Amino acid sequence: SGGCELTVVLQDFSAAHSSELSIQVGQTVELLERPSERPGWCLVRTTERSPPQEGLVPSSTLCISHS
């Protein structure tokens, strides 16, 4: 796999791209990667919902840390 971390969406979002999905503010979904390559963005994947799902949005809508 690589690396997955638990993250919560700060704002609701609706898919649009291939690996995109509709999310809502308050839920928890594990992010795929980090904003190292991209500053200000974050991903969202669900594993507690078979089959899992994956998403893409900006850190504004995804729980982040920022160094």
Take residue 26 and report the two structure tokens written for it. Answer: 């308050």
Domains and CATH numbers, the chain: 1-62 (2.30.30.40)
Q: What is the Cα–Cα distance from 4 to 47, expressed in whole angstroms? A: 10
Angle at alpha carbon of residue 45, lines to 65 and 13, rounded to 5°: 80
Tokens 């994947």, located at residue: 45
Q: What is the maximum span of the chain, computed from C-alpha positions, in angstroms?
A: 33
Take residue 29 and report the two structure tokens written for it. Answer: 């979904």
Strand partners of residue 30 = 6, 45
Q: What are phi and psi of 18, to 5 degrees?
A: -50, -65
Strand partners of residue 56 = 43
Take residue 60 and report the two structure tokens written for it. Answer: 């504004």
Q: What is the Cα–Cα distance from 23 to 58, expressed in whole angstroms? A: 12
